[PDB]
Design a protein around this ligand. Structure first.
Ligand code: M8T
Lengths: 180, 180
């Protein structure tokens, strides 16, 4: 019912609000050695993939060969809930276009969507298949509303919502990436 | 309403099911250098604190001075949702009794409870104060039910549910720890 509402606020309170204030510094750190006049710098914002109907794989290259892992940012650490130095790591990806690097950004799925999809594997979860696609849409809706009243976070990330038709994901990212 | 139901399944699918199969190996690794005849070994199971009415701090020593951080386990890594080598770290704590180490175990709060509590800071979250204590209880209830049908995970962790009265948390852990 409201499972998407809780996962969205959990995603915001327990992740975005923690890493986004520190993201630009980590990106600036990586760009200091990586950036030169032979290629564009890593973009500044966090780009979040929000597939409405996808299994959400772990390797982005399997969703699109033009999305290839490039490097990790410096890790971020912080004590949380009894775990010393809980680790927040993020990966930089290159976007290929005609066999050439056309963009570079920190890119990842909104992991909770992967969790919604996986709840269909458990009868006790009570998550049907028709309900799954609706909760996915509600997850993106509440998340967008949250960032609307949180400009500090809205400026440090970009949501990329889409639906796998039965389309190049690298292009959709490059589209958002070219408006920055 | 059912916010606790989603956070419980998220906690299971996206964490316990991932680290618990590998926990004993990480503990065995740490015990190889740490364990000798002058002190007990680190316990085998993951002990999870489930406060029903607590702000859930990040430093366990602030909840009880007899709970002191000792060391981290070896990290666990795994690609997830586009993040290469997402990091899972856990902390070992000593339980003091009469100024002497009486136990050693991997110990942490159930982080989602900390998230429930924090949702009261946002009007758009719609989480009142009366609803907070009820969702906390429902989180522990669904989690217990999940582990009931998951003996592979139930044997590698122990839930410690309690309620801060208006009581020694180190003792409650030592009680569970002495039945192992
Ligand atoms: N390494 C871990 N150490 C301790 N506990 C963990 C860990 N992993 C999972 N758990 C437990 O399992 C719940 C559900 O995890 P999830 O499905 O990945 O959903 C996450 C995820 F989408 C995003 N997020 C947060 N940190 C990162 C990160 N480092 N990378 C990417 N993404 C993140 O925010 C959501 C809520 O995070 P929260 O913490 O409040 O709840 C979690 C937590 F209780």
């Amino acid at each position: 019912f409201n499972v998407a509402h809780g996962l969205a606020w959990s995603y915001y309170i327990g992740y975005l609000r923690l890493i986004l204030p520190e993201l630009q510094a980590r990106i600036r750190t990586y760009n200091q050695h990586y950036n030169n006049l032979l290629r564009g710098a890593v973009s500044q914002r966090l780009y979040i993939l929000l597939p409405l109907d996808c299994g959400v794989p772990d390797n982005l290259s399997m969703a699109d060969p033009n999305i290839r892992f490039l490097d990790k940012l410096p890790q971020q650490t912080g004590d949380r809930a009894g775990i010393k130095d809980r680790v927040y790591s993020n990966s930089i990806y290159e976007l290929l276009e005609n066999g050439q690097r056309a963009g570079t950004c920190v890119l990842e799925y909104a992991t909770p969507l992967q969790t919604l999809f996986a709840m269909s594997q458990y009868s006790q979860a009570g998550f049907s298949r028709e309900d799954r696609l609706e909760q996915a849409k509600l997850f993106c809706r509440t998340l967008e509303d949250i960032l609307a009243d949180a400009p500090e976070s809205q400026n440090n990330c970009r949501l990329i919502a889409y639906q796998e038709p039965a389309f190049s994901l690298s292009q959709e990212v490059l589209r958002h990436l070219r408006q920055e």
